[PDB]
Design an enzyme around this catalytic site. Structure first.
Site, PDB file in Angstrom:
ATOM      1  N   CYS A 151       8.580  -1.380 -39.070  1.00 20.78           N
ATOM      2  CA  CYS A 151       9.886  -1.645 -38.464  1.00 20.78           C
ATOM      3  C   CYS A 151      10.995  -0.934 -39.253  1.00 20.78           C
ATOM      4  CB  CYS A 151      10.177  -3.153 -38.375  1.00 20.78           C
ATOM      5  SG  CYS A 151      10.197  -4.079 -39.965  1.00 20.78           S
ATOM      6  N   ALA A 211      13.041 -15.028 -51.357  1.00 17.56           N
ATOM      7  CA  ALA A 211      12.778 -13.852 -52.174  1.00 17.56           C
ATOM      8  C   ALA A 211      11.273 -13.655 -52.369  1.00 17.56           C
ATOM      9  CB  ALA A 211      13.497 -13.963 -53.529  1.00 17.56           C
ATOM     10  N   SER A 225      10.158  -8.678 -48.929  1.00 20.90           N
ATOM     11  CA  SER A 225       9.953  -7.529 -49.800  1.00 20.90           C
ATOM     12  C   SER A 225      11.102  -7.478 -50.811  1.00 20.90           C
ATOM     13  CB  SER A 225       9.900  -6.233 -48.983  1.00 20.90           C
ATOM     14  OG  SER A 225      11.118  -6.056 -48.275  1.00 20.90           O
ATOM     15  N   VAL A 245       5.479  -6.926 -49.656  1.00 19.93           N
ATOM     16  CA  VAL A 245       5.949  -8.228 -50.166  1.00 19.93           C
ATOM     17  C   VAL A 245       5.551  -8.404 -51.642  1.00 19.93           C
ATOM     18  CG1 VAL A 245       5.440 -10.733 -50.033  1.00 19.93           C
ATOM     19  CG2 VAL A 245       6.419  -9.532 -48.065  1.00 19.93           C
ATOM     20  N   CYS A 278      13.940   2.294 -42.619  1.00 24.65           N
ATOM     21  CA  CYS A 278      12.676   1.839 -43.215  1.00 24.65           C
ATOM     22  C   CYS A 278      11.469   2.667 -42.748  1.00 24.65           C
ATOM     23  CB  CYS A 278      12.413   0.377 -42.891  1.00 24.65           C
ATOM     24  SG  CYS A 278      13.498  -0.708 -43.742  1.00 24.65           S
TER      25      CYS A 278
HETATM   26  K   LIG Z   1       8.325 -10.803 -52.920  1.00 25.60           K
END
Ligand SMILES: [K+]
Ligand SMILES: [Cl-]
Ligand SMILES: [Cl-]
Ligand SMILES: [Cl-]
Ligand SMILES: [Cl-]
Ligand SMILES: [K+]
Ligand SMILES: [K+]
Ligand SMILES: [K+]
Lengths: 392, 393, 391, 391
Positions: free
Chosen positions: B379, B246, B250, B347, B92
């Protein structure tokens, strides 16, 4: 001009190289990586806790799980506080890893690092596209072929790109076959002479309910028949071909790792460094012309440091194909008796992500005090990396 | 003694819109999105393409993309064949790690001008079948998104399941997470409607034979929400006492980001106005399950290194891998929420994993005012994090 | 003992769905249960009277153990009912009826169900057992591999039809005119309500969705006559004659008949629809399958001493337009008496079902006393034929 | 017209090869061709006399179009030979012989070939048609999905067998003793030359290597009696009885018989081996398949008016040792008359072939005038049985 930390190699270790589906095929690349990393820290004579960061070259990562370098590192028993990055410059990955690690050390961003490469071509999977199955079926592609060995732009195998250079430079089948037999001869003599005693560590393969197998030397160099070499068919070009299975490199499994530190940190840790990393460079050409990219990378390094080709005691030019080495010898006009003296990828094999690290590790052990070594390695896409070291 | 290094500046930062999974950008491979972003950045910086000396791109799921992903992106943007390329995988954190490694090269004086960024097409990630003998009773075809992208090796569970562990430890409940999520969507919509991505994002023409051209000019994921449904959703990563959904995690996405980096000396030689200065950066790692807290340690390392205080930072970009992660970082560092992820984040905007680290740095570059300090952290699977500090010029 | 006389008591079918179309959510065995239950209902007998069942079904891969047993138990028939699944490729549905008739004739059973079922929508892909070859792995389509490729010649069934078109001088414009005529007749018969007794509706039920009732064949509306003469010749690029429009299509459906001895029909006091008069199989050189039905039909006529003119209605399965034209050409029969209500070119061709459908259609369409002859070619060079007389 | 008498004139088979063993390079259809050509040669008749062919074959996926046609043409029989492939799971090879007997009895043919074939080594894996689900998918093994899993209970046949073990109190030690008995009888029969007229050799030819001649069954040598009681009960963890040793194995093979009317044998100056007296099918709850052969055998005995004592030898297919013991117990028969020369537990079980093998074995092993009874259970809860008398 920047004032940089001096970078030294304190150890260089590798697993033996296994044949395709051969002796090390039950081991994932990350496990081979763990073995080489542990071996290298042992040989350096330092606490594992001293290693601050790790970079590992690794070309075919599909199916290996999340963060391959992290897996190799934690698998070698290094602290959970060790940051990890996996590097892909195709065939140059193992060298580029060492280069990038060197740059961190030069900047004072870390004082001790592990850098190298790993590959398990035996365990590279096949892929199927996401989406809906077309009427009539589909071929699932081999990632070795698709991601590793096929040029994107020319839509042909690396071996067919090599035939292109064979033409332009007038490098015939018989010359390539002679270089190949030379490589196999040199590899055998080196192993017989015990030249890999410090460099290679044995791997014990364990299978439940069967006896253990200790793999303590390279598997590939014994898989040849000199009488058959000139009778082999040219696989990448049926018409006027020069490259064969014997005179090209093979598909293999292996890992290599180096402990690198600042000259300062070597002193603090009371360890004796093996060699100094002096300079390195990347060069690129037309994708089809990859076999000649190492000429340019090497010249850059020499020019940067103000040395002449004759100042180099030992050359390691990766034997991706016998053609590649001959092309380099011809264009550079160097003494072939100084090139790949203890064999190379044509006879020892080519786990693509590790070869770049192996050849630097080999110079480190083989060079005599004060001597200069130059390693160079071509890569898919038209690239090459090269590195100059000096023995201590 | 400390080395004397070259100063590194950001001259331009450019990205594609982010497309939803199997959505508006799904016909395009990761490398093509890379080529679009790379050409964008060069054009925006006003330099000739031949000035760029080397390129690094983050890219996590490289399987089936073909040989040398970064080289493909670079040559497809019409950069010289003389340009060396390297593909970076710190999961990531990949897009940020590419910028950091390029910076170190510049600092060393090994190059004077480089492109760094990230790229990911999660829509086009394939399935895998193992080499060898077919086992009696069946053969598995694994999803590489799940196997290489989202599954912790050591714990044998999804990232979102690991996230539940930190939610537990720091007592961060479902409602706070949901609040953060709605906040993210709200900010994103506001920013897009305000024209805040006017110089950041470049639009994409999708061409299909016979079909009418589609022009994707804005991020796709932020409109895909219903606030009334948010509290109703099920916690899909844990049966008992879950918090991750969900809605507040993200999503899977496609996109690319690229930055043109150079030495101060090169920016002078070429007569371009640098946008920002790259001050410092760091990597930290903790227990793999504890990856949500890793950016805390990485951010602290950066501040301690430069001798700055948390209160000195004008704008924070903490990657919204999960609403949870941002909350935990807000908690442990005790910073002002109003300074965090000001114009949305992963997100609401999406998380094309190799691209995101490059995106957030690119965003600070455009968002900060003259002289302000911005800190970006992210992260990564395995228990890591990267962080970067920049100052607007 | 002496051979028993066999009668058809009922004949029922599902609608025929298009490839990945209206019925694609239902496995072949479920379609089979629907057809079998409907035939027993129309027959007016208890399910317990059915003694044994044979179903045609060509592409059985992935359907699970014993497809015919699944269809039979799925329709609620007794656990004491023995079941056998029959594969004679495209002739499977007819051959099931022939074999069941032979058991009845022997006095080994008195009441049976026979028919055919296929869900081409659900036919899977296959991967070989063994070591994955270097350089790639091929996943083959069972429709193509088991259903549509001739083993000996290594060509599609459509290429075998091209071969007969050459030998018998059957042109593209002739095949296209036949196809348009099949589509025309199918639509006319649907509009005239001619399938009201033959076809039973299927309810498709999806969790959280409203029920969908499928009441009519899907395929016959899927055509554009103005484009027919413009279509590419897919089986042969140069000088071709066979196209997607003039060939049969891939489809889903099931058909089932209740068969009885004359004695059992009387015992149970049912009204039989037709008597089974005679049947035969013939086989020729594999590439020549389009003409095998000529020999099979000639065999049945000769066996009972009838001449071609004595037949009121012919069902010559429309595997390709080419096949029907070849049969008419060789037999010299009146085209206005052939496939009068459409056929497989416009209605579709769920391969294991078609042989049963065409027998069932004769049973409903013939007038009292009239003879109907059904014939159907099959991959490998075979054909089956059956002669019935309406009661 | 009255029912015709049916006779077996020859019965021939390949050796049975182990899973991925000696015959694994041969497709099922090629084994079928080998057995068919052998049977015809042994019959001593012109191959043109064979009018039609039925072959049992359970796992047809990936074998190509019309498996029986492939076996038939591959054996050099005329292209005028109609062909049908039969699937009654484990009973397929017997059911083929029964259906062919019905055709002959009706006088619809005078000479046929019937038998069965299977290559479990070459059965493929399947992938569903459609779009691949996020998270991946398991490609299913057709041996497991179509061959060995009960649809209704969703468990392996081996687990269904455990139900009968519990109900009839047939313990692990008893099943193991039966299994050891089968291996012992198989070896002894092979050593005594008892298969000299039944089995024909197969030469396996590979380019660049020497020929391998496969002349005997492969499976019965793969055993160690001392390890039999130490094996795990792989179908049920707690209170299990069925193991890999006491169950049948996965195998490759084919068997074929030449069948005639008594009139046809007279016309062709052929001396037949045996007469087909009677046959029957029975069915019970799918889980209870091991007991179906009891009902099928009782039907045949009752039909003909024989008592169990009148039977010289029994072939009760060894799908599991459990099945044979359940049968011996329920029918109360002398165990010394049962599977005298071994059976499926030790010789192997190519599922589509075994029902034909056991009838062919009786034809060779019975003495003049003696009656033999063969029975075989099948997945879904079925069984078939057949009574023959040696001439
Ligand atoms: K989302
Ligand atoms: Cl490159
Ligand atoms: Cl990390
Ligand atoms: Cl046929
Ligand atoms: Cl049954
Ligand atoms: K070689
Ligand atoms: K059509
Ligand atoms: K066994």
């Amino acid at each position: 001009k920047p004032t940089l930390k001096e970078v030294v190699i304190v150890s260089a270790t590798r697993t033996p190289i296994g044949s395709f589906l051969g002796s090390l095929s039950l081991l994932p690349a990350t496990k081979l990586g763990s073995i080489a990393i542990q071996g290298a820290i042992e040989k350096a004579g330092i606490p594992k806790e001293e290693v601050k960061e790790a970079y590992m070259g690794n070309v075919l990562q599909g199916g290996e799980g999340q963060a391959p370098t992290r897996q190799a590192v934690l698998g070698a028993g290094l602290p959970i506080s060790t940051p990890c990055t996996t590097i892909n410059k195709v065939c140059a990955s193992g060298m580029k890893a060492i280069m990038m690690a060197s740059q961190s050390l030069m900047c004072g961003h870390q004082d001790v690092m592990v850098a190298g490469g790993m590959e398990s071509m035996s365990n590279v999977p096949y892929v199927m596209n996401r989406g809906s199955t077309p009427y009539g079926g589909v071929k699932l592609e081999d990632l070795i072929v698709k991601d590793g060995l096929t040029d994107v732009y020319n839509k042909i195998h690396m071996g067919s790109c090599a035939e292109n250079t064979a033409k332009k430079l007038n490098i015939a089948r018989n010359e390539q076959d002679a270089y190949a037999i030379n490589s196999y001869t040199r590899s055998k003599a080196a192993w017989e002479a015990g030249k890999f005693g410090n460099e290679v560590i044995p791997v014990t393969v364990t299978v439940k309910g069967q006896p253990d197998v200790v793999v303590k030397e390279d598997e590939e160099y014994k898989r040849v028949d000199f009488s058959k070499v000139p009778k082999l068919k040219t696989v990448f070009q049926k018409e006027n071909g020069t490259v064969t299975a014997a005179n090209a490199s093979t598909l293999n499994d292996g890992a290599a790792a180096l402990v690198l530190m600042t000259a300062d940190a070597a002193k603090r840790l009371n360890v004796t460094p093996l060699a100094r990393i002096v300079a390195f460079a990347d060069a690129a050409v037309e994708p089809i012309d990859f076999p000649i990219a190492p000429v340019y990378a090497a010249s850059m390094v020499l020019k940067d440091v103000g040395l002449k080709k004759e100042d180099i005691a030992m050359w390691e030019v990766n034997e991706a194909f016998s053609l590649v080495v001959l092309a380099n010898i011809k264009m550079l006009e160097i003494d072939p008796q100084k090139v790949n003296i203890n064999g190379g990828a044509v006879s020892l094999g080519h786990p693509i992500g590790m070869s770049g690290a192996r050849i630097v590790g080999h110079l480190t052990h083989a060079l005599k005090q004060g001597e200069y070594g130059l390693a160079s390695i071509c890569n898919g896409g038209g690239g090459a990396s090269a590195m100059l070291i000096q023995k201590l």
